[PDB]
Design a binder for this molecule. Structure first.
Ligand code: OLB
Ligand code: CA
Ligand code: MG
Ligand code: MG
Ligand code: NA
Ligand code: NA
Ligand code: NA
Ligand code: ZN
Length: 350
């Protein structure tokens, strides 16, 4: 039949190349596709929280950029679903290509030396994103964007599969979980497109989730936004495991900072050295020294190695307490106590 249309237009007409299954300005006349708009908050709030945590912890620029790029994708989608115009449509679909390009760079540079740039991969991703954008603007076909975004996700999937199968099998739960929700989100994306029915919405209890659960494109933002967030976590974790210090590194850090305390002239050096010494002590306490490599981690010699570190950590905490109390000279003099306890309980096992 030919009844009344559910798309209750207000605040400008739809000039965008495509309009989703969600009824235009049905909940409120202020924003179009209400649930497709508000669902982008999980692609705005958590990635921004991840971006500020990354700058505070002093992480690599590419990991800060990856979190901010997802926020741009979220903000762009929030602007596109609200207005439903071609101008804001590009602000949503184009950053998806750029964010994925940043993610591809991070995933292929995870096992590279710190403070190094691969200009060959960087110029390839810039050239790819430039080619994709230029033709997408000229030929306004949305299917082309979906294909080019799909192959970027596919290359990102293969790298994540290679890492979990050959390098870090620990990231199986995180890596595969990210992948699955994303495919679950992509499944729901086609449910809203192909099975576009307002019947469920119309028949009953629209205010509850039954009315709301049928907005599968909104659930797509919820799942891909959580999925991309997970991927960044996965990417970050891959880098953290590679840049992670071993027992030999921690033992060197423990001793270098111990000599720093002995030769220190100001409070900041002593405090800094004790902080770095505590981090190295707790990390070396978990590890097995080369002389105990044959023995079990629960052996009496191993319990003695951990006991020596328990005394050392405690004495570092005592020295940090003195440093935090303004007793610089007393905290500085703790170095000989720390030197004695390592010589009497730890040094014999290395
Ligand atoms: C496994 C990690 C993948 C990282 C992807 C990074 C991009 C951000 C993720 C999701 C944005 C969703 C909201 C934007 C959705 C816009 C609709 C569109 O054109 O989608 C194209 C796809 O349906 C083609 O499959
Ligand atoms: Ca719509
Ligand atoms: Mg670096
Ligand atoms: Mg001074
Ligand atoms: Na329309
Ligand atoms: Na659902
Ligand atoms: Na080493
Ligand atoms: Zn969308």
């Amino acid at each position: 039949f030919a009844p009344a249309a559910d798309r209750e237009g207000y605040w400008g007409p739809t000039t965008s190349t495509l309009d989703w299954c969600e009824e235009n300005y049905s909940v409120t006349w202020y924003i179009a596709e209400f649930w497709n708009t508000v669902s982008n908050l999980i692609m705005i709030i958590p990635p921004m929280f991840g971006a500020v945590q990354s700058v505070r912890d002093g992480l690599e620029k590419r990991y800060i950029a990856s979190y901010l790029a997802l926020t741009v994708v979220g903000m762009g989608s929030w602007c596109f679903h609200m207005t439903l115009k071609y101008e804001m449509q590009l602000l949503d679909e184009l950053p998806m290509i750029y964010s994925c390009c940043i993610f591809v760079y991070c995933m292929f540079e995870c096992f590279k030396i710190k403070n190094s740039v691969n200009y060959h991969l960087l110029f390839t991703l810039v050239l790819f994103s430039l080619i994709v954008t230029t033709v997408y603007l000229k030929v306004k076909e949305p299917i082309f964007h979906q294909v080019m975004y799909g192959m970027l996700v596919f290359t990102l999937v293969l790298r994540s599969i290679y890492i979990v199968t050959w390098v870090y099998p620990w990231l199986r739960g995180l890596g595969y979980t990210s992948l699955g929700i994303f495919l679950l989100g992509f499944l729901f994306w086609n449910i809203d497109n192909i099975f576009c029915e307002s019947l469920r919405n119309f028949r009953k209890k629209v205010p509850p989730i039954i009315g709301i659960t049928t907005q599968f494109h909104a659930w797509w933002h919820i799942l891909t936004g959580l999925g991309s967030y997970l991927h960044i976590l996965f990417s970050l974790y891959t880098r953290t495991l590679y840049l992670r210090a071993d027992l030999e590194d921690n033992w060197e850090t423990l001793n270098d900072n111990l000599k720093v305390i002995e030769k220190a002239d100001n409070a900041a050096q002593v405090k800094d050295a004790l902080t770095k010494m505590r981090a190295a002590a707790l990390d070396a306490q978990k590890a097995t020294p080369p002389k105990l490599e044959d023995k079990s981690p629960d052996s009496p010699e191993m319990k003695d190695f951990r006991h020596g570190f328990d005394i050392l950590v405690g004495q570092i905490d005592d020295a940090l307490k003195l440093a935090n109390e303004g007793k610089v000279k007393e905290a500085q003099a703790a170095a000989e106590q720390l030197k004695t306890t390592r010589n009497a309980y730890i040094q014999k096992y290395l």
